[PDB]
Amino acid sequence: IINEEVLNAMLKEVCTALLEADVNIKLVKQLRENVKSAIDLEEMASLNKRKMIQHAVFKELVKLVDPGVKAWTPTKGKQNVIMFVGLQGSGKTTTCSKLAYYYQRKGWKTCLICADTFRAGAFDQLKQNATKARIPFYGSYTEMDPVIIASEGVEKFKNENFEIIIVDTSGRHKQEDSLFEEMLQVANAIQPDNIVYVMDASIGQACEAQAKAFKDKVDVASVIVTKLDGHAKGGGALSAVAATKSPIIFIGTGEHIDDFEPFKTQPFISKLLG
């Protein structure tokens, strides 16, 4: 009896923390029965209950962030095309320059393509970013067909033999079929080696539905969770990984170009957990 109450006590505490880290409530309820299956109060000899339970919780979170697919990597000498997709405001344009700068300081020939023909200032923004970081950019103040821009950009930087060709696209949401089709046309056009779904860490329960639809329309292969600076929890990332069948590769930790680091699981989960 005492053991049951203890277990229901820690578990209620874990589950309330997880929901307020913006984990999908279905995920939280599933983990709860997953930790219950994996724990037997009766076998525990006199040892400490909490520590085994905390481990059991933490071990089940680790399964959730691991998609069991190894993250994709660029290959030296070949033309690597990387495409950015994500919801409106998710951080795509800023992250494009962050990823380019990451690779450029690691010795890669990187460029940027602004193929956002909708957002006011979309080229200016990417242009200014790229210029401050000494990274080649390509776009147009006049062209309105983003498939043309992304095609002309990708080929141009290939004829100049770049290694990292990063295409920035417009923000779009799942219930806008014309945007989700335009996104399909850009991907088919440039044939990217790696599509990055970008998600704002402050996203709530809507994450699984959006992220799933991005993966249903286009072969999302990677995830970058932005705005994890400081205090953000980012529990939507679990829905994102499960929905897009992709690993989280980096995290964005601020507005500046160097606020960018490769994703590591345990510290992310520790912050998530407590």
């Binding site: 307020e20 200032g121 923000g171 709530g204 809507a206 400081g230």
Partner: protein
């Protein structure tokens, strides 16, 4: 009481809490909501119990969505004109939520109704921030609502202190007789004290007529933290004895969340402040006012 009365209520209250959470109500708001239902229902037929909590929840949700009195911008602008001072409006919010886009929608709306507006470009930090505003001002000038001037962008490029630009823009506005100043500010996380302080300075130095928090309906539990923190800087960093606080809410990207509508409640719960505008898309006409019934209806069907 009774004990199995309470027992039946809480069991169905729990199913409702897990329902509001799934629809993106902030968990602890969802919790406080039901505990309030409990106090109201307790002391006074299983289906009636189900229907009594479902009905009683619905009643409180409507009350939460529309607190105080609906905000009447065009009417209050008239009072500003009678005093011969611009009606000043500040937009604030975290990174990416739709401040610059929705400021433009609003000016379209004001312009079509015959009011001159000066857009203050007081995001002097983020790349593009000003070209982006500039594109909107050029498009809004087409409304013409020729001689005189209805829209102008007040701007000083990047790098400069946004509390000072905003003071100049307002003074310029009064000087040229613009009806409205729309102050765009830069995206900032709510736990970044420097940015939170500078925002508070812009506000307390300039004391606008209306401070509008911009939140996206895609946010989850941070809907509460953003708003609590923003109102705390505004209060903590005020120089007035009367602290200047957030006046209302613009809830954006309502077209992205299907029925997971609950962020409307997170934000109307923690302030006694109304949702002045709903963003329903990326264009000038995607600006709705909030219908409580339609929101609460969504929140029950799931």
């Amino acid at each position: 009481m009774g004990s199995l009365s309470r027992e039946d209520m809480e069991s169905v209250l729990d199913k409702m809490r897990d329902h509001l959470i799934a629809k993106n109500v902030a968990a602890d708001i969802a919790v406080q909501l039901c505990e309030s239902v409990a106090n109201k229902l307790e002391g006074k037929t299983f289906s009636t119990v189900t229907s009594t909590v479902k009905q009683a929840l619905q009643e409180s949700l409507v009350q939460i969505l529309q607190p105080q009195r609906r905000v009447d911008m065009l009417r209050d602008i008239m009072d500003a004109q009678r005093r011969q001072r611009p009606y000043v409006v500040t937009f604030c919010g975290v990174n990416g939520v739709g401040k610059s886009t929705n400021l433009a929608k609003i000016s379209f709306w004001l312009l079509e109704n015959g009011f001159s507006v000066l857009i203050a470009a007081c995001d002097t930090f983020r790349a593009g921030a000003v070209e982006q505003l500039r594109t909107h001002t050029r498009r809004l000038s087409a409304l013409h609502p020729g001689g005189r001037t209805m829209v102008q962008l007040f701007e000083k490029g990047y790098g400069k202190d946004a509390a000072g630009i905003a003071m100049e823009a307002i003074a310029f506005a009064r000087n040229q007789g613009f009806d409205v100043v729309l102050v765009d500010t830069a995206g900032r996380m709510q736990d970044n004290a420097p940015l939170m302080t500078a925002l508070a300075k812009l506000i307390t130095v300039n004391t606008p007529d209306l401070v509008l928090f911009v939140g996206e309906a895609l946010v989850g539990n941070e809907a509460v933290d953003q708003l609590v923190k923003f109102n705390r800087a505004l209060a903590d960093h005020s120089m007035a004895q009367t602290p200047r606080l957030i006046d209302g809410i613009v809830l954006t990207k309502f077209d992205t969340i299907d029925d997971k509508v609950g962020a409307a409640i997170s934000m109307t719960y923690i302030t006694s402040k109304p949702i002045v505008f709903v963003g329903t898309g990326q264009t000038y006409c995607d600006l709705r006012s909030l219908n409580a019934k339609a929101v609460v209806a969504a929140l029950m069907k799931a």
